[PDB]
Amino acid sequence: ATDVIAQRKAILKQMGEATKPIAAMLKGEAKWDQAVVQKSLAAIADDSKKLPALFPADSKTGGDTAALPKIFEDKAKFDDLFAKLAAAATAAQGTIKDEASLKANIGGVLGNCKSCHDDFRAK
Numbered sequence: 001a002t003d004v005i006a007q008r009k010a011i012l013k014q015m016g017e018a019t020k021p022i023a024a025m026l027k028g029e030a031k032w033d034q035a036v037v038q039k040s041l042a043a044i045a046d047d048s049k050k051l052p053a054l055f056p057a058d059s060k061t062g063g064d065t066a067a068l069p070k071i072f073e074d075k076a077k078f079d080d081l082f083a084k085l086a087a088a089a090t091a092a093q094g095t096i097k098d099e100a101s102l103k104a105n106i107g108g109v110l111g112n113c114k115s116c117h118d119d120f121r122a123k
């Protein structure tokens, strides 16, 4: 075993950064860029496929993590929420093709972030 807590925080930090250009477009502070959006959705999908392998029970007493112990009492649900986000971002690469579809469809993707945080991340 190795520092999976450091690994997973690095990947989730990247996920956070991938949402930044999308938020900027939604705010009207950055112009629509289909390539940038595709890049962010692809990162979100790839990160979500990697994260399921980085939350071992032997790291529940890790010390520098915001992961809640609840994760290990509902692991199937936790794992599947990442699969849900991976599938949402993957579907969004096909459904988000212009600014209008970004505004109509991005919520389905981003809502998964809060859904998991409310149950499994420290506040």
Ligand code: HEC
Binding pocket: 005, 008, 009, 010, 012, 013, 015, 016, 017, 019, 044, 064, 065, 066, 067, 068, 078, 079, 081, 082, 085, 109, 110, 112, 113, 114, 116, 117, 120, 121, 122
């Ligand atoms: C559970 C299925 C999750 C999903 C879906 C998403 N996140 Fe999350 N995230 C989760 C946990 C358990 C944690 C704590 C990790 C730890 O070990 O401390 C996080 C953390 C983050 C972070 C902070 C990373 C850091 O630098 O320490 C960010 C920026 C973050 N998460 C972003 C984020 C986004 C943008 C998501 C949706 C696209 C998202 N997370 C989903 C659990 C889960």
